[PDB]
């Protein structure tokens, strides 16, 4: 499927490979949880693995189902 990926400088959403049909969205109190925090690494995936205690990636089985918690251009 397609899921927003922050891989690129800007923001966008492409169709994962023939190995991922899900969608994720990392998150962690970045080095600025004070103002920023929670780094969403929008992207795609075939599922949701273990994950870290601080750095966790969401999961979904639909396109644009793992958007940003602040989605917005510029």
């Amino acid at each position: 499927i397609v899921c927003h990926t922050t891989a690129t400088s800007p923001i966008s959403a492409v169709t994962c490979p023939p190995g991922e049909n899900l969608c994720y969205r990392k998150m962690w109190c970045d080095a600025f949880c004070s103002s920023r925090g929670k780094v969403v690494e929008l992207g795609c995936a075939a599922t949701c693995p273990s994950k870290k205690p601080y750095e966790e990636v969401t999961c979904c089985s639909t396109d644009k189902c793992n958007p940003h918690p602040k989605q917005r251009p510029g």
Partner: peptide, 13 residues
């Protein structure tokens, strides 16, 4: 490089 909850800039907003 991510959309950091801060914004959507490739560098913590």
């Amino acid at each position: 490089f991510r959309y950091y909850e801060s914004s959507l800039e490739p560098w913590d907003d």
